Amino acid sequence: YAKDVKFGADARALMLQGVDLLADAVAVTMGPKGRTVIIEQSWGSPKVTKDGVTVAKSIDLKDKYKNIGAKLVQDVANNTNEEAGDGTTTATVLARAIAKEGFDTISKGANPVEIRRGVMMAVETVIKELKNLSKPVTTPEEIAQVATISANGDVEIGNIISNAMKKVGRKGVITVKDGKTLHDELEIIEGMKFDRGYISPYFINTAKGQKCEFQDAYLLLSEKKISSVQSIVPALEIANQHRKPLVIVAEDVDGEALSTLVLNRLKVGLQVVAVKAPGFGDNRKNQLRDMAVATGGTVFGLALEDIQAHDFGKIGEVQITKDDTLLLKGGGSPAEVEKRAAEIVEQLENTTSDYEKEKLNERLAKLSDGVAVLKVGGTSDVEVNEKKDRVTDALNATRAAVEEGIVPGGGCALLRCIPSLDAIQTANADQKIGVEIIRRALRIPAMTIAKNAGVEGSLVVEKILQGSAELGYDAMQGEYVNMVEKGIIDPTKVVRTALLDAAGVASLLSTAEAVVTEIP
Amino acid sequence: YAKDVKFGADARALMLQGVDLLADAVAVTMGPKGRTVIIEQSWGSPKVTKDGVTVAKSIDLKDKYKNIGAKLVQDVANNTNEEAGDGTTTATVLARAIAKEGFDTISKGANPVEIRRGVMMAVETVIKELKNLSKPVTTPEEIAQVATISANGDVEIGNIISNAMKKVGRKGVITVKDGKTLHDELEIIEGMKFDRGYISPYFINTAKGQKCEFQDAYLLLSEKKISSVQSIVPALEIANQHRKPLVIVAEDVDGEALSTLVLNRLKVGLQVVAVKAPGFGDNRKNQLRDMAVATGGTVFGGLALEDIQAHDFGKIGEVQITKDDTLLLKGGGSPAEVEKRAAEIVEQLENTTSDYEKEKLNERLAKLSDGVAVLKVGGTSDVEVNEKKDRVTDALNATRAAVEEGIVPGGGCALLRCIPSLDAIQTANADQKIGVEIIRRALRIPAMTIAKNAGVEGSLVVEKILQGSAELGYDAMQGEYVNMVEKGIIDPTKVVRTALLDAAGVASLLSTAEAVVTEIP
Amino acid sequence: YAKDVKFGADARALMLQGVDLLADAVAVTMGPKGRTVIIEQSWGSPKVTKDGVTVAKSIDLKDKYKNIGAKLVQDVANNTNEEAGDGTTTATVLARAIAKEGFDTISKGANPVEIRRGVMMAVETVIKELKNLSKPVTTPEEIAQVATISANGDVEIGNIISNAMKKVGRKGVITVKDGKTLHDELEIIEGMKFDRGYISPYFINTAKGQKCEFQDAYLLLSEKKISSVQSIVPALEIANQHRKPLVIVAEDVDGEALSTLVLNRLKVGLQVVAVKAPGFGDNRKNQLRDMAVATGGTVFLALEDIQAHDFGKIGEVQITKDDTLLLKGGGSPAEVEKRAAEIVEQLENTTSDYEKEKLNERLAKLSDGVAVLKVGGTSDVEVNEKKDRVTDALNATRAAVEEGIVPGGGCALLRCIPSLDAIQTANADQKIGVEIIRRALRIPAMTIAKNAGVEGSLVVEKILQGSGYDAMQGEYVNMVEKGIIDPTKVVRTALLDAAGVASLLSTAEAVVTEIP
């Protein structure tokens, strides 16, 4: 239980060493000419990868302080990845640059608060000019073009993504699953997606995604919090006797019930997953009722322990990831669900609250609008799985592009925001120092990509900055071209979130004046 | 079992090094512009915080003597926090300053007794002039203003705090809990509060922190000391049969009964919490009877144990038991049962003449009649509700302290304004003057630390405040010398007074130690 | 848990040292005059071998980075061996040469991308010239000559291999098995072969390769995936009551069913082997039904009610990681030619080329049986040794049929050097990579000469400046007609795999290893 504490510059230097190691490992994968990282496995052949995310996840340091810094940067870059589908490497390298420059300037006597205030000013200016620079993607032709670009010249993949988006909309739900047909195809089916994940890991998938994948499962709905084991044993035995998976949607599953669910999940292989009910307040119960009528079940909170297996709903397929749950095939009657929406539209014409209208319309969309499942084809199952990974990545990229537009790739989007930093109303010298830190960091992504391509980063950056507009550097072909015209693009959401999160983590490391670790 | 013993300044140096490490960790969080402390969690991500309390709670050194010093200062600061609601960081930094300067002067040959005499003298002078400087908070409008200030400019939180305090009084019972509604609201229900905690760890909610809370529980009250398993098994099985938690209130629960209650709770999962009966002497029996009639149960003292028929149990809708107090919320007792029990107390109030029995009789009557005000915080997200509950709890404790002892200018500027007060002290010898100078240097430390964490140099800021008017301090958030009382930069007088008193006490205790005995590792 | 990472040339040097050790061990076995490697065994006398493959498989280093490099090269060379049947040593030595030269040039300031672009250009040019150099083997006389040459001047082995290939075609199925007769003989029996392996290690034949080789086995076929123990217990009970092995061909066996199956064979020896159903989509179901009618079983109405009339019969089955052989069928012939009539009727109507290929492949599986080679002899030990030799000769002959033959002794690569002089290089680094490949091309012949006793520095120059150094004879002859040949597929795949692994090692800028 012993502790060791370091203070100020001494601790920040160790954490900076950790982030230096992490970003040195990650940055070699940047750009189309990214290099290879070899990661030793516990068993089998070593892993060869150019993926920044898997490289960052594999890094773990022995010394406590540098490990702490690396873990902080890893968490920030990872939550950047989960939002936009990319930008882990960009966030990591930007964070290292900003943290290094800030620690060097602070350790020489600069005021940390007046540096963070000014680093944030430059970041805000860069974000504003980046949003000004973004080219929106709204038309189906633009969507197909972006999807094909993210699919690396696959016209079929871009066309199927564009058709799915046209058929369910930009706000619609799109998922990709393994296809058993030689040709990829999409279809619109009923469905329901809410942003609540599993309470604790019950991965039956036990594979990529860290989710749960049942098929032909039961649905147990309860407004009451389920904590008594005696009130949940009958449901578990009813589900087990029919050998169907059970999905428990309650306000909260905890205590003895959660303990028994975990024990049975790992001892007798019980296929049960507990997920918190979506929403809050009275909207929780309305969403539960809507879900129950969609699945043809009933809600408890009926004594909750007298289940007769007619109380359960039916779920054809369910996918429960960390922060959201997808219910695919409902068991409720179409006449049942169409009448439930009638109540919602009746309440729409009466209630006029802005907050109440949004929730009711979202429930209406959940009941009426379905999900779009596109299945990826191929001549072999491993080809189908690899194409599934590629199509998922392209779909996330296209969703980000529709959300926030596109900007020139190769790090040139951040490079073209440099001239906007020369007109910031800075108060004192430390604010200018922070702005200069951000300005120096803006060149890091493009320079790293150039270095990975083999050419010198400084000269390429100088030519791009002192050259014609929209003239970037295509590393794969080794020539200065128009990036957006020739398709070298990145989603604006990716770069914006990466820069914002890197600045946030760097400022968090700059605010740390003491680090407490455990004596090994 | 071997022991190592160090003497005098040699051991005091190690203990001072420990408190130096602890206070250096804590002080970086001081002030509204405080810095960040990273605490490595054993499992999961590192913990990033600016709270001095959790920073001090997480420090535990390797060497025995410095760990002893750190633990002493931690305990003093922690018991400062429990009584007032804040001042852990202030107490820690003041304690380190006083201990450092006292050890330096004493080790140079000064008399420690005649230094502590004079440190305490100037502490008394500072406290007197602080009470003189304190502005009382008595009117409901002032209470609402203070609550809104403490809630960081949220009008509804201040209004709801002021409404609750108005509805139950300044001496009344207020607790904050999670709310399921989007809108925050307060209501007054029956209740009972007494300063007795759990006998042994029974924490159902470890996340809440050393609290044992559940709903719809049975209650058995025993005048006799429950120490036999045979007499408590029937009650336990009766409570288990109905799937209801059991609360044991008795003169003392110990021995094999306590051992079985702890072991079965840890292993099987018994929903049982044992709490010592409140009061002492003949009053303990009287308020045990009062609790029984308030909850609808009966007192055991043919009314022996192992004869419970579940009609001898009191019913409690909600119970919260913490380390230092217990809260029974919803009583199952009949309203007519309790409205005629208070008649007995009133009748005894005519007979009593001790002028102290009447105080306890009135306290029992108030406990029977006065309820508790529960206010549930609203929000659009459950996590938002939890965080707002924490914020409202902190604001409510600050407002309670302010009502108790008034308010003073914040940012440690009250201690800054008490500096000229001690220039006129009848010092006997030089050592008393030395102690007075030690405390004078200490008085500037909180404001200087807040300024340093803000970025600016505190040495110039303190002198600028001292040489200027008696109303302009330092914002340190806007970096402007402002009228802090009018602008809203205030601190409760109770918090600062207790912080200074406890820091002086722990420094004196650390400077009276002439021998430290540790165990050979 | 804790990780240690090295960057750039520092890590590439450790990996190069590891591959240096591995290739130094392997290269002493190259050529007809290859030297001897003694590998210590856990029990018994040490193993004395001149085989590059077994020496390479017996290398494991203590330091993390050099072991990582050695294992990368090992895996590349091994999967080179599994495709063509030879070239492990060739691939290893070429990989070491290319990696050494490339690392030395890169560490001195060259651009790795502009080196790999140009190394691959030279490799492609060498491949084109090698395919130009190859003499195709298509006639039965040439097939017999190649088989006899591979069999070390064994006329009978060459004759039997050539006859088997003639009787089942060059695309046919040929397997080698121990013979109980004094004289080796072949026969064509009904049989089936598809590229699907065991889901989990199930080897009852622990030695002589990783094989599941039992006889007189039941066969169940399931279109749906099998993951429930409730749906597989009846099959196991039925198979165990009759003391007959069970082969499971399904879409996928995983989860509780797979765990129960793998645990049972370990503890009681259930004699159960599972294998994923071959193919994809509709072709999977069609050929699953074809297999069912070939074995007499039925496809799976559920997995609970099975009995035994729904069980295909397999006389002999051999399952490796990449392919499954079902030797003896159980279905009635009137059932199998009736199914073939439907296949030819469907082929008579369809005109798509891609769909006709799978139809004819299914028809060949149904009708064209497999060919077995029983190897004769006077002792079981000699029969097994001859079986190993004949299997090697058959693999070499089939590779030669695939892509022709080229002069052996490393001369095939040596004769592509003069054709490397005409390459349009963009910059100096591409020329440097071309030079790396050019220097590496001499390495196999040089190693063979060095192991033969003579020094290859003069041997290579004599071979080039003239009109090939048979190492065993010691005289420069024309290797092709003399008999010193290698399959063109072997050298092509070895060169390509060595270049690929060397490029992969050159593109590595960071190695992440675990703290010991």
Numbering used by the authors:
A (entry chain B): 26 to 326, 332 to 550
B (entry chain A): 26 to 326, 331 to 550
C (entry chain C): 26 to 325, 332 to 498, 502 to 550
Which lines from the publication concern this structure?
The crystal structure of mtHsp60 reveals three domains: apical, intermediate, and equatorial domains. Our results showed that the E. coioides mtHsp60 (EcHsp60) forms dimers that are incapable of hydrolyzing ATP but can reassemble into heptamers, thus restoring ATPase activity.
The resulting truncated protein, called naïve EcHsp60ΔC, was purified as a stable heptameric complex at both 4°C and RT. The β1/β16 strands form a strong interaction with the β2/β3 strands of the neighboring protomer and stabilize the heptameric complex. The thermal parameter distribution of the naïve EcHsp607 coordinate showed relatively low b-factor values in the equatorial domain compared with the apical and intermediate domains, suggesting that the equatorial domain is stabilized upon forming the heptameric conformation. In naïve EcHsp607, the ATP-binding motif, DGTTT, is located in the N-terminus of α4 helix and forms a pocket with G414 and D494.
